[PDB]
Amino acid sequence: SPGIWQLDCTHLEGKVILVAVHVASGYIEAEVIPAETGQETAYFLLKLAGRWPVKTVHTDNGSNFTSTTVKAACWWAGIKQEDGIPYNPQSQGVIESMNKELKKIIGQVRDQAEHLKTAVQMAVFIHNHKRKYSAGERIVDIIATDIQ
Amino acid sequence: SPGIWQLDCTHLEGKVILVAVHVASGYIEAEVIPAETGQETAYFLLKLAGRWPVKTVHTDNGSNFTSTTVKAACWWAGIKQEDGIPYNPQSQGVIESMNKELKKIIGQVRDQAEHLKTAVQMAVFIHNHKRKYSAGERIVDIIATDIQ
Ligand SMILES: O=C(O)c1c(C[C@@H]2C(=O)Nc3ccccc32)ccc2c1OCO2
Ligand SMILES: O=C(O)c1c(C[C@@H]2C(=O)Nc3ccccc32)ccc2c1OCO2
């Protein structure tokens, strides 16, 4: 549905890349953090929910699901926190392929940026703009349709 | 029109709040930084352009307009950099009112967050969700219409 997002955490260069995927479109937002904490995850979700109409988040692991700080952010922002258990198993493989794909793009841009965070944002750009309609186009269409 | 954004820089608690406003909708994204530099502005624009289809940015001052780093980011992301000179003078006053309004909201949430950055993201949330349709709804509709 239009409001469903999935959290995803992947590792690169001794750092963590936290990713939110809009499940119906494939659109992503991402940030680099030193390590996955409840505090970082809570702040990331607050940013996300101020930018898109986030109704439901499938959390990436049990620690973030349990985190009182993540729960506080979800309460504040009106997000239903759910487990991310892939009862449909093609869900997990799609996330796995996306992490591989994002890492490939990061490799392709890596030498154009001094800092990993910049390379990650370049990769977000390329991912969201790539036509296959683009993910950026798909999310806007899905949400506009839901509004009207 | 769907692709036009305006940069805006305002001060609070000895820090800087960098804001991008989607002119046709009133939708905003914002971040807290220690001070306005070309490097921070460049990174902010890269993030913005990976998330929304940014065609044109009216820069907030001559230093960011001149900055080689900001120019590099605009080139990379396919953004036309323009001056933000308000040849229509009601433009400035609208930005002024928005800064006042954002600061009011920040004051209303300030005690719910330990860190200013959190209060700012709460304020972004409230601003974008407030029905006036909300700014969040307006930007999605404008861009979806442009896609079709
Ligand atoms: O105290 C903070 O500023 C803070 C919080 C808690 C804050 C709150 O009290 N309630 C609430 C609700 C939603 C998001 C963040 C919060 C979470 C994560 C953070 C924070 O600073 C940066 O990363
Ligand atoms: O070198 C960086 O990582 C970097 C850049 C330059 C980088 C580039 O070389 N080209 C380019 C194009 C678009 C955005 C950033 C850049 C700008 C701003 C930053 C940076 O790190 C964090 O804040």
Quickly list its features.
homodimer, 148 residues, alpha/beta, Nucleotidyltransferase, domain 5, 5-stranded mixed sheet, 6 helices, globular, binds the ligand O=C(O)c1c(C[C@@H]2C(=O)Nc3ccccc32)ccc2c1OCO2, transferase, HIV integrase, structure based drug design, dimeric, integrase
Write the layout of secondary structure elements.
Two copies of one chain form a homodimer.
Chain A lengths: L3 E9 L2 E8 L4 E7 L4 H14 L4 E3 L3 H5 L1 H10 L2 E3 L7 H20 L6 H14 L5 H13 L1
Parallel strand pairs in A: 1-4, 4-5
Antiparallel strand pairs in A: 1-2, 2-3
One copy of the ligand O=C(O)c1c(C[C@@H]2C(=O)Nc3ccccc32)ccc2c1OCO2 sits at the interface of chains B and A.
GO cellular component, one term (chains A, B): host cell
Organism (chains A, B): Human immunodeficiency virus type 1 (HIV-1)
Protein name (chains A, B): Gag-Pol polyprotein
What does it look like?
The structure is a homodimer of 148-residue chains. Chain A starts with a strand and ends with a helix. Chain A is globular and about 40 Å long. Chain A has one domain (1-148): Ribonuclease H-like superfamily/Ribonuclease H (Nucleotidyltransferase, domain 5, 2-Layer Sandwich). By secondary structure, chain A is an alpha/beta fold. The first copy, chain A, has 6 helices and 5 strands. The longest helix of chain A has 20 residues, at 90-109. In chain A, 38% of the residues are buried. In chain A, helix 1 runs parallel beside helix 3 (68-77). Chain A has a 5-stranded mixed β-sheet with strand order 3-2-1-4-5, sandwiched between helices. In chain A, strand 1 and strand 2 (15-22) form a beta hairpin. The interface between A and B is medium-sized, with 29 and 28 residues.
